[PDB]
Design a protein around this motif. Sequence first.
Motif, PDB file in Angstrom:
ATOM      1  N   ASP A   1       0.846  -1.191   0.000  1.00 32.12           N
ATOM      2  CA  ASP A   1       0.000   0.000   0.000  1.00 32.12           C
ATOM      3  C   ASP A   1       0.883   1.243   0.000  1.00 32.12           C
ATOM      4  N   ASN A   2       1.273   1.703  -1.181  1.00 31.19           N
ATOM      5  CA  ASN A   2       1.962   2.983  -1.296  1.00 31.19           C
ATOM      6  C   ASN A   2       1.628   3.569  -2.663  1.00 31.19           C
ATOM      7  N   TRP A   3       2.380   4.580  -3.078  1.00 35.95           N
ATOM      8  CA  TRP A   3       2.024   5.368  -4.248  1.00 35.95           C
ATOM      9  C   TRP A   3       2.564   4.801  -5.553  1.00 35.95           C
TER      10      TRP A   3
ATOM     11  N   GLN B   1       0.240   0.087  -5.849  1.00 34.75           N
ATOM     12  CA  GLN B   1      -1.130  -0.033  -5.368  1.00 34.75           C
ATOM     13  C   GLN B   1      -1.919  -0.980  -6.261  1.00 34.75           C
TER      14      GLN B   1
ATOM     15  N   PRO C   1      -3.169  -2.439 -25.381  1.00 36.40           N
ATOM     16  CA  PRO C   1      -4.544  -1.928 -25.448  1.00 36.40           C
ATOM     17  C   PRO C   1      -5.284  -2.374 -26.696  1.00 36.40           C
ATOM     18  N   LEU C   2      -4.731  -2.077 -27.864  1.00 36.94           N
ATOM     19  CA  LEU C   2      -5.338  -2.476 -29.122  1.00 36.94           C
ATOM     20  C   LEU C   2      -4.829  -3.853 -29.527  1.00 36.94           C
TER      21      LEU C   2
ATOM     22  N   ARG D   1      -5.860   7.119 -20.369  1.00 35.70           N
ATOM     23  CA  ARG D   1      -6.510   6.169 -19.483  1.00 35.70           C
ATOM     24  C   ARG D   1      -5.894   6.185 -18.098  1.00 35.70           C
TER      25      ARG D   1
ATOM     26  N   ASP E   1     -11.590   2.730 -28.601  1.00 35.63           N
ATOM     27  CA  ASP E   1     -10.629   1.674 -28.293  1.00 35.63           C
ATOM     28  C   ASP E   1      -9.338   1.850 -29.083  1.00 35.63           C
ATOM     29  N   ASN E   2      -8.825   3.072 -29.153  1.00 34.95           N
ATOM     30  CA  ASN E   2      -7.545   3.304 -29.802  1.00 34.95           C
ATOM     31  C   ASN E   2      -6.432   3.219 -28.759  1.00 34.95           C
ATOM     32  N   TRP E   3      -5.229   3.657 -29.122  1.00 35.22           N
ATOM     33  CA  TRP E   3      -4.072   3.505 -28.249  1.00 35.22           C
ATOM     34  C   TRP E   3      -4.079   4.453 -27.058  1.00 35.22           C
TER      35      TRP E   3
ATOM     36  N   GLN F   1      -8.267   3.756 -24.281  1.00 26.38           N
ATOM     37  CA  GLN F   1      -8.706   2.372 -24.164  1.00 26.38           C
ATOM     38  C   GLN F   1      -9.393   2.132 -22.828  1.00 26.38           C
TER      39      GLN F   1
ATOM     40  N   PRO G   1      -4.231   7.019  -5.252  1.00 25.48           N
ATOM     41  CA  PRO G   1      -3.909   5.607  -5.002  1.00 25.48           C
ATOM     42  C   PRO G   1      -4.148   5.164  -3.572  1.00 25.48           C
ATOM     43  N   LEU G   2      -3.897   6.024  -2.590  1.00 25.46           N
ATOM     44  CA  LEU G   2      -4.111   5.647  -1.203  1.00 25.46           C
ATOM     45  C   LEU G   2      -4.524   6.874  -0.406  1.00 25.46           C
TER      46      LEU G   2
ATOM     47  N   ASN H   1       4.011   8.317   4.500  1.00 22.04           N
ATOM     48  CA  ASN H   1       3.153   7.144   4.560  1.00 22.04           C
ATOM     49  C   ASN H   1       2.200   7.157   5.743  1.00 22.04           C
TER      50      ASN H   1
END
Lengths: 106, 493, 493
Positions: free
Chosen positions: A47-49, A52, A79-80, B207, B328-330, B333, B360-361, C257
């Motif tokens: 759990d950090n940046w 995660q 992705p594609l 994304r 749904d391109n690069w 997505q 994230p946290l 943290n």
Amino acid sequence: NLENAGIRGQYKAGWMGGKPVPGYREEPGVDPSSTTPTFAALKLMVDNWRWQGVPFYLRTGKRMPKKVSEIAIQFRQVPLLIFQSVAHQANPNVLSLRIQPNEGIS
Amino acid sequence: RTPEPLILTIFGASGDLTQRKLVPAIYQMKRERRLPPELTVVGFARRDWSHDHFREQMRKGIEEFSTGIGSEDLWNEFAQGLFYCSGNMDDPESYLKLKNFLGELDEKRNTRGNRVFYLAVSPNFFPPGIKQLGAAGMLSDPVKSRIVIEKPFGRDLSSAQSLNRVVQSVCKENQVYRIDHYLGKETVQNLMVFRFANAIFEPLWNRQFVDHVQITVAETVGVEERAGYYESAGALRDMVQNHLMQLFCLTAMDPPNAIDADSIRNEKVKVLQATRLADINNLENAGIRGQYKAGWMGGKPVPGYREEPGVDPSSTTPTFAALKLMVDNWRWQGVPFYLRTGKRMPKKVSEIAIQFRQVPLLIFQSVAHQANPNVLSLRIQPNEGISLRFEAKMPGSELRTRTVDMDFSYGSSFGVAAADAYHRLLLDCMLGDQTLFTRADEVEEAWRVVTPVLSAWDAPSDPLSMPLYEAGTWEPAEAEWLINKDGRRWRRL
Amino acid sequence: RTPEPLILTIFGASGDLTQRKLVPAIYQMKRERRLPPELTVVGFARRDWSHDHFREQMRKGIEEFSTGIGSEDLWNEFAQGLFYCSGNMDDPESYLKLKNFLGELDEKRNTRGNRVFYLAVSPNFFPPGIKQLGAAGMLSDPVKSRIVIEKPFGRDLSSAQSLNRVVQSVCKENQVYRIDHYLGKETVQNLMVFRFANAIFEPLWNRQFVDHVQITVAETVGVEERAGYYESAGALRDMVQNHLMQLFCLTAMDPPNAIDADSIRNEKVKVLQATRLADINNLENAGIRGQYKAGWMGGKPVPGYREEPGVDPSSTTPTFAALKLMVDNWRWQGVPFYLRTGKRMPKKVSEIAIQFRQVPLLIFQSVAHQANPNVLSLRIQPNEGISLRFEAKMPGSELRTRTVDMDFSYGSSFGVAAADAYHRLLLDCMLGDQTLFTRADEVEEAWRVVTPVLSAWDAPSDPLSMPLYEAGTWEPAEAEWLINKDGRRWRRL
């Protein structure tokens, strides 16, 4: 629910190198009907940046087929998917180190 | 800047809406001394009119629907240059007479040989007119001839393809101006200069951070004296094809390498080539429709759609239409888009909202164990501007966080306002560049994208199965379920 | 959350400024139920005081330099915990007498044993006082005794090291509080929450988007009083090590943290451990001195530095500074950090300006052909808030950009400030949280960073070699050359 983050085990009679091998509760000194584990597996999370949501899986054991040691990293999927190709393209690229006989990076 | 001499031989026959929209507008533009001082207008209709007859008809129209004539002698000076011809829309002798008329009347100032034909007629007349024009060889030199086609360009994929093929055989491109929907200037340019001239906004469109986009437009009037046209229409064919699908292309486009019009339109065509419905198999996960009834807008009750002057007693014409798309391109997505539109809603907002991902946290615990993610909320109308919403600290003695915001308005901090858009579009047509005029590939692309749901909805069904919503409410409940099935929420504006 | 009762000892009390700095604050705290009714204070020092004399002097102090005594019955209810025990500073017998007095007060007043020792003696007496305090073993239990050492914590690196070694050998490094600084509980927490609770401002903070940062702190009051105090220190041990080295740490700090003091202080030390000047060998690209001479301020004449009482007309003590630090870690490699301070400059203000980079390629045209890049403008002085400037579109039929900015002031959505910083400092000292104080490592590292320039400027030189700026101009031209050598300009503010 500890059953989702760890599994113990124990090894019984089988075959190793073409010669019969006695089970764990047969060795000269162990007590029959024991409970000491031999195979252990876990699932840790960080759990950090920068880590995660990327789970880590650990393993160990005894009386496994051969001695190794690996640190396998698996990368995401592109992705594609224009190059669908064959075999469902279920071959993501990994980067594996090695800390055992045949040391190297692959 | 300053255009050239030209002859605006309107091909729209005799009508009311077309002349009322055009002649007052062009007269106002000419009054503001921006066009070249000498110009000519040629009249075409399906009747015999004296020069004084339609001259005074236009005089009455301009006096009724404007602030009158700025001068007195200037009215007659302008009118000297307005002529009427005789002919029809099918007679070859009609085009022969028009050719003779032009070849004789172009003597004054020689018009440098330049001509343009503005077309405003019922949609079924486009093929005959274009075929007659092509066979007659009206325009051959691709330097001084232009043709303008008005809304609508079609109704489905096959008709659009047929019309494109037919108009391609007569003349090449760079001459057709498929004017219809007008997303006027001072908005597209504003969006470009805001997006591609800063170094703190471009790296935040991936994304990686963006999680959710949505676009909404809303009206209040609903249905009006244009019931004669709207009786054969729908939300899908009225807005989602002409306005929202251009806003989406403008939002999701890639950065162009030059400021030329060709590059911009090429990029738009490229991006509008990987957009698809989310669940093509089952339309119930990517489409909802509705129709308003029993309204109470304002201080008085308002009748429903099925019960008002001019109706179909058992009809299924929709008025609300959600949608879901997934590029749904690069770069985009796995990031969903939502489009929503309708009629008889309280406010007439039209906005764009981008919702970023969560941190994230969570070192810091907010109020009620929940936090509001950041949002960028470009507004289009009214009071165009940009807004942001981040997090700050409550002045208490504990780590409690609220949400504040910053704003920016163009009108108050820049000038006062702008001018009309129809005159700007006419001037741009006059000058000879095509920045906002759509090319003949994106029309087919939009029709292909929206065809499946269109075909599914077009099949007649039980008139009692149409979802309804009382005029004043934002949406019917099925759209709410569609949005909530994933864990998001419509932005209550 | 009111702290538990205890007894205070004020070493070197009954002197100067101790009354006006302590008695009104503790009186206001007690009146606002900040402490339980079991709070007592005790005096010290050698002059033959009296309990009635103590009451009279405290009454005079609160009447003259505070709001007042309020209700007389309130003072009657307060006046039971003010005693005195005369004794020399270096008398072990007086120390044993103090211990016996403290024991008797614990037995009678029933303070439960916990204690906090306050020290306010002259700064040239810390070693003997600490050594003699540790001789009698007054500090054994961990939560029973806290000692606070007033400004300043030495002058040069060697003195600070000796003081640290002396302190380390008496008590564990868990009770010593070095007070120092003045950043309250508003700005620090506000900035940390703003940085570590949003998902947009974080990714744009590394070395590939940021170009340089500037930190400014300015004052308008002259030398005022304490001429003897200033002459021995100068504006490098007064404002460039205490205050100005906290904004740098808070701005260039890696994310923590947790929230407790441990992680914050560890990250601050880790950041401070990897900094250095720019040109150590040649001290002409990493420092400029100054001194303010006669000038105009507020439409009235103001004398130069060498006309005040107590300052000889040959002194070379600076009143201006300018450095150029640089960080050398994996994130801020190659981005200069220009610092600043001064006195007699106009428009008292503090600021933290971050300037971003330019776009990869430019396709648009600027009105002034300057293309000012974006800026964040965190503010700390009054009218606190965050302001950011970006580009927009000039109205008209042309593509040009003009710089405009958003704004968000804390004084509109908020404005109810907390109590005096001293009151919160004392409350935190009583309860116990070292977040706002400084560890030994931070002090030693700051001294190591500033050592070379300080040593160079301390050496004697020509009396008339000091660059001079009149009262009112922003700075002597040498600083302008230092900043313009690279191109980036001083913030106009």
